[PDB]
Amino acid sequence: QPIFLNVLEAIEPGVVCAGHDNNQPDSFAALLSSLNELGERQLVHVVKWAKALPGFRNLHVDDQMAVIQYSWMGLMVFAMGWRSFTNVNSRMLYFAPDLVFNEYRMHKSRMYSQCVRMRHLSQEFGWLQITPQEFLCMKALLLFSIIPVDGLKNQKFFDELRMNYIKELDRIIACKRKNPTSCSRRFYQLTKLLDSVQPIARELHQFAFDLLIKSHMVSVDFPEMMAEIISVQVPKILSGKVKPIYFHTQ
Ligand SMILES: COc1c(F)cccc1-c1csc(N2CCOCC2)n1
């Protein structure tokens, strides 16, 4: 029985819609208001998903919310890239069924560069032939990929959990591979892909923060929970107090 993968499939969120009005001309304020609403809705699902992951209760209660909050943007990026690949072969960014970005919308959103980096990530899911099971284990690992310089309340419990998710990824890679060289090559590819999420998430964090600071001038609404993340947690990342764990750092 593949217990670990059984769980990851079982907990995977279903479809989340933004509530956007597609039946009006595009505007920056409406697009970003809808993206923010989608982010709030996604956050509720990400919390419920994370809390149901294998071993998640091993973390100190004081650390559980913090790692979700730090990782939320990257998790959104990685899952949206997958949706975009699977649903539309990377032709568009599939933020939600009712919030699909073509290049016009990427431009209108003022996050064109971030968007095209996400489109490239989408493409990579196909070029690398990422399997659904690789995707699920990678996404879980991505939750455990950002830590504070000053330490979590219980860093050792986090460290052990992270280790265990890397071991699961090793197990998934080795399943149909009959050769430690083939396993190594695949691990290299997958860890490179995971590392590539991080600069995208940082760019999106910078945009989110800048937009929140000017939000009252540009008519863009930020829902409560995601606003709190952007004003409390995100600056800790952007100031370097909280940093990603890069597999391939130098
Ligand atoms: C679910 O929405 C997203 C996704 F699917 C992939 C990447 C980012 C988002 C998202 C939702 S709210 C958001 N930000 C808040 C507004 O500034 C840009 C970053 N990004």
Author numbering: 670 to 919
Show the paper's wording.
Endogenous androgens—testosterone and 5α-dihydrotestosterone (DHT)—activate the receptor by binding to its androgen binding site (ABS) located in the LBD. All current clinically used AR inhibitors, including enzalutamide (Xtandi), flutamide (Eulexin), bicalutamide (Casodex) and darolutamide (Nubeqa) target the ABS of the receptor.
In order to understand and eliminate this undesired partial agonistic effect, in the current study, we investigated the molecular basis of the interaction between T878A AR-LBD and the most powerful partial agonist compound VPC14368. A crystal structure of T878A-AR-LBD with VPC14368 bound to the ABS, was resolved at 1.2 Å resolution. The asymmetric unit contains one molecule of T878A protein in complex with one molecule of VPC14368. According to the solved structure, the AR LBD consists of 11 α-helices arranged as a three-layered helical sandwich and four β-strands organized in two short sheets —a well-documented fold in previous structural studies of the AR-LBD. The compound is accommodated in the ABS by a network of hydrophobic and Van der Waals interactions, as well as weak hydrogen bonds. The phenyl ring of VPC14368 establishes hydrophobic and Van der Waals interactions with the surrounding side chains of M743, M788, M750, F765, L708, L705 and with the main chains of V747 and M746 residues. The thiazole ring is stabilized by hydrophobic interactions with the L705, G709 and the side chain of M746 and M743. The morpholine group interacts with the side chains of A878, F877, M743 and M781 through hydrophobic interactions and forms a weak hydrogen bond with the backbone of N706. Another important observation is that highly conserved hydrogen-bond interactions with N707 and Q713 residues, which are maintained in the AR complexes with hydroxyflutamide, R-bicalutamide, and bicyclic-1H-isoindole-1,3(2H)-dione, are, in fact, missing in the AR-VPC14368 complex which likely also accounts for its much lower binding affinity.
